[PDB]
Amino acid sequence: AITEIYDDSTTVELETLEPNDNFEYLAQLNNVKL
Amino acid sequence: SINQKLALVIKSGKYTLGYKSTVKSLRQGKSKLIIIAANTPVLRKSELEYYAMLSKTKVYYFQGGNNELGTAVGKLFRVGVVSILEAGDSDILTTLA
Amino acid sequence: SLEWDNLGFSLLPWIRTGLDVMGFETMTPVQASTIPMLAGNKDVVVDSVTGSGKTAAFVIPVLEKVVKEEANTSKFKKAHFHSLIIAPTRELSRQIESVVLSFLEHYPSDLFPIKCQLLVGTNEATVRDDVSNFLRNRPQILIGTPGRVLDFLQMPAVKTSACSMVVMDEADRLLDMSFIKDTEKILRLLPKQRRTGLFSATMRSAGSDIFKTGLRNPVRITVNSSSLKLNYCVVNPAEKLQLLVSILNNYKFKKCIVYFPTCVSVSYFYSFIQYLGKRNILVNEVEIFSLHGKLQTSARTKTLTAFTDSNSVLFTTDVAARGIDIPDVDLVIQLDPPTNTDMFMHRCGRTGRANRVGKAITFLNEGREEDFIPFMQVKNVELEELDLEVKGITANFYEDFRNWILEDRDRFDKGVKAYVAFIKYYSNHSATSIFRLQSLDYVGIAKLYGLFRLPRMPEITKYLNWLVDPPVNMDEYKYKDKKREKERQETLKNISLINDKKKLKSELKKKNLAWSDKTLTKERKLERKEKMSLKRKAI
Amino acid sequence: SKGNAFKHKRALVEHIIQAKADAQREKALNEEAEAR
Amino acid sequence: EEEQIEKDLQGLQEKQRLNVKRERRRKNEMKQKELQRMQMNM
Amino acid sequence: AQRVTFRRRNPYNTRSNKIKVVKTPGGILRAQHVKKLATRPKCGDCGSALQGISTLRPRQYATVSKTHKTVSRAYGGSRCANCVKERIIRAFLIEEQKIVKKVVKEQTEAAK
Ligand SMILES: [Zn+2]
């Protein structure tokens, strides 16, 4: 979540999204194995 | 790492997973790099090696089996060979990997 | 900075020239935060207020990607396209196409041209004409509604393999439960490795359904800023139309958009209000139009372009609610609250551009009106109550409606059909607690439509006949149309035959029900025992 | 249905239609409860 | 009259909560099952 | 309801003699000995049934034409298609590797 402010006092919020949840699941499995 | 670059290519670039798609892209000359797992059969691996030699396409030997390569791609099914048509937002081609 | 010159990727000279000729004097925050990323290997999910440069925000990256991927060259193949754009309504897609054409006006010559094609359901062009001129003209941009673009892509003459850019405008509406069936197929046909741009003013509502589109590398974007007034009136339903009249001939406006629930209601009330204006019930320089989505496409386009072009009132369904922008619209009336509340903000959102003085009004049924206002309040919408006197209803309004219905049986049929359609529309209502079928004023609504008999419905029988105390027989009711008058008289002369056909159908349905022989046996036993007790108790 | 959830065709049809209604309604359920 | 609204609101909220818990459990189970199937053929 | 038995010398329930019951034009139920069914020819590399080749007894092949027991491709009637394709690819790749090894050897003793 990154907020950017312009000259009109209007802010834009930009957040990256993760469509493939498998990356997190494999990462958590590897972390618990570690 | 090397898996991060592959994941970046999957998310942003252009790619083909599987032997048939990789061979088709090599025939069309649309491939920039081919990643080959260590689990691939010797005949198909040798045919891919000969095809890459014919088409002058870079070859990288993945350090793992087909399911490790699939997980690196982010898929829950085994993939034996991957072809990178366009790196996109990643830098796998620049780093010679 | 909001300056075109200091953007990341140095927009093409002809796109810059088109922007300068069109103007905008700068780039909006939406166009500042979306164009750099939608052309930079990132999918885009954009939520922004109406009329904030969103259309150009997804049109400029489309042209940039088309030029970048060498789509405008002789190397590009035939029967292939590059970019697709989808919108839920035909007018919105045509407006997007007009914007793209305006941008391509300044496209330089001496190079392979870039063209667009609009694929909407029309009665002036079959899908095969679309395929023919797609093959002949070879465009790289397709813009259209889900149905006709699905039909177009399903034709074997069109190849989708070279597509690399999909844009969905009003993406919350296209991922709705109704549209998801078509959009799933449309995205199924197209290649998965692509760049997707979803743009909608209520993109947050389609929460987890955005991943159904197939986003790869997405970045959600939220843009936020009394422009307009939001009022409501709580009145008896039978007076509602009269109140509408009392607004049309008294309030000050240049354009008033009046929303109706159904299309048949639009036509029926348009005809009745025209009849009232014939008798000079309302005296003003008002021109009244009707525009619902079941018309032929050419008629819809002609009506919309006549209304857009002096004080005008529009009777429209939810087709015009979302997306399209008619300038100089002052008043918006929602004769009923919408079936879904998410569209409410769109229906009253046609006004307030650049903080213009515009008013929105809504009508309530007096029964469960205590639940709609807090429901909007929880959703951060404040509705200030407005008190409007019901002028001119001293006598004969429902009587006038009734005696106008008695002139032509077609008017009776249209009225009853509209009432039944509204009842079905109310049946499919979200927020069930707020809008209850039991608490619905069936008699009030029937009085609103000028009917004199409640149609046979399960709702009428259960939750609740002749509104006019001296009943009128249908036998002496004349259809007033010569071709159908003889058909009605023939059917009347065949009353017993059709009745017996239905009787035989009913008996055959009885014999085909679950274990019908056993049911007849049980009825025999019950009838024997009951008819025995009916005399044994008395004796 | 492989797990003995439905005992006959009527149960399957009723489950289908009830699932359709509940899918129609959950989206407004939250604000519907918050308002009260 | 209002008892029906309260009753079906509470019932369907309870149904949604149970559905959320059940869907989380089912997703975890199916994910583990397909991972085990992938790693089982060797 | 009429009972039938073997029509030959063997009285035992052996795989050699098996009985079916048929109604003759005389209106009676009678036994009939059934021969052993034929077996589909199998590929000599993978053991799968060969496609396009008739299934007959060993001695019934001598009385049919060659097109009923062969396939027009090389090794047709002996090996299936995928095995032949694998043989071709493997032979070509082996020859190419032999060429490469010979070139490398010619280079490596070219030093002295
Ligand atoms: Zn074989």
Tell whether F17 and F52 lie within a shared domain: no
Tell whether C58 and C194 lie within a shared domain: yes
Tell whether C63 and C116 lie within a shared domain: yes
Closest CA to C11 of C24, C29, C31, C1: C31
- Give the residue numbers spanning the domain of F81: 38-112
Contact C297/C123 with Cβ under 8 angstroms? yes
Contact B17/B79 with Cβ under 8 angstroms? yes
Tell whether F51 and F105 lie within a shared domain: yes
Tell whether F49 and F103 lie within a shared domain: yes
Q: For C252-342, where are the E strands, in sequence order?
A: 255-259, 286-291, 311-316, 331-334
Tell whether F32 and F43 lie within a shared domain: no
Split into its structural domains, chain F has a count of: 2
Closest CA to C450 of C464, C468, C465: C468
φ and ψ of C267, to 5 deg: -65, -45
B88: which chain C residues are within 8 Å (Cβ-Cβ)?
Answer: 41
Contact F4/F19 with Cβ under 8 angstroms? yes
Position of tokens 């939750």?
C463
Distance from CA of B51 to the nearest CA of F (A): 11
Structural element, H or E, at residue C117: strand C116-119
DSSP code, position C220: E
F36-to-F14, F18, F28, F56, F68 alpha-carbon distances in Å: 12, 9, 25, 10, 21
E38: which chain B residues are within 8 Å (Cβ-Cβ)?
Answer: 67, 70, 76-78
- Give the residue numbers spanning the domain of C273: 228-464
Q: Which two tokens stand for residue C539?
A: 């004796």
Q: CB neighbours (10 Å) of residue C428? A: 9
F88-to-C233, C526, F51, F91, F99 alpha-carbon distances in Å: 85, 85, 20, 5, 17
Closest CA to C386 of C404, C403, C373, C399: C373
Split into its structural domains, chain C has a count of: 2
Radius of gyration of chain D (CA): 14
Q: How far apart are CA C529 and CA C531, in angstroms?
A: 6
Q: Do chains C and F touch (3 or more CB pairs under 8 A)?
A: no
Q: Closest-CA residue in chain B for C38?
A: B12
F19-32 burial code (b ≥16 CB/10 A, e <16): eeeeeeeeeeeeee
C45-82 burial code (b ≥16 CB/10 A, e <16): bbbbebebbbbbbbbbbbbbbbbebebbeeebeebebb
Residues in CB range of F92: below 8 A, 6 or more apart: none
CA of F60 to the centre of ligand 1 (A): 24
Tell whether C96 and C80 lie within a shared domain: yes
Closest CA to C216 of A3, B15, B65, E25: B15
- The alpha-helical segments, DSSP class H, found in C379-465 are 397-405, 409-427, 442-448, 458-463
Torsion sign, CA atoms C185, C189, C194, C195? negative
Tell whether C23 and C77 lie within a shared domain: yes
Q: Which two tokens stand for residue C180?
A: 């998801």
Tell whether F71 and F25 lie within a shared domain: no
User: Sheet holding B14-17: strands in order across?
Assistant: B14-17, B81-86, B33-36, B58-61
Residues in CB range of C54: below 8 A, 6 or more apart: C30, C46, C48, C169, C199
Q: What is the dihedral of CA C270, C275, C279, C282, to 10 degrees?
A: -10
Angle of CA points D9, D11, D14, to nearest 5°: 110
C105 belongs to a structural domain: yes
- Residue C444: alpha-carbon gap to chain centroid: 25
Distance from CA of A24 to the nearest CA of B (A): 10
Closest CA to C428 of C452, C450, C459: C459
CA of F80 to the centre of ligand 1 (A): 4
Tell whether F21 and F44 lie within a shared domain: no
C509 belongs to a structural domain: no
Task: Determine the 3-state secondary structure of B84 from DSSP.
Answer: strand
DSSP C264-287: HHHHHHHHHHHHHHHTTSS-SSEE
User: Sheet holding C311-316: strands in order across?
Assistant: C286-291, C311-316, C255-259, C331-334, C358-364, C228-234, C384-385
Tell whether F58 and F68 lie within a shared domain: yes
Beta pairing partners, C311: C286
Tell whether F14 and F30 lie within a shared domain: yes
Conformational region of residue F77, where left means phi above 0, alpha means psi within -120 to 50, and beta covers everything else: left
Contact C194/C82 with Cβ under 8 angstroms? no
CATH number at residue C294: 3.40.50.300
Q: What single letter denotes the amino acid at residue B97?
A: A
Residues in CB range of B15: below 8 A, 6 or more apart: B9, B82, B83, B84, B85, C193
Residues in CB range of D6: below 8 A, 6 or more apart: D12, D15
DSSP code, position B57: -
Tell whether F96 and F69 lie within a shared domain: yes
C519 belongs to a structural domain: no
From C166, C195, C222, give the residue that closes a domain: C222
φ and ψ of C289, to 5 deg: -125, 155
Tell whether F32 and F4 lie within a shared domain: yes
Position of tokens 């009253």?
C348
Tell whether C252 and C217 lie within a shared domain: no
Tell whether F45 and F15 lie within a shared domain: no
Q: How far apart are CA B97 and CA C396, in angstroms?
A: 86
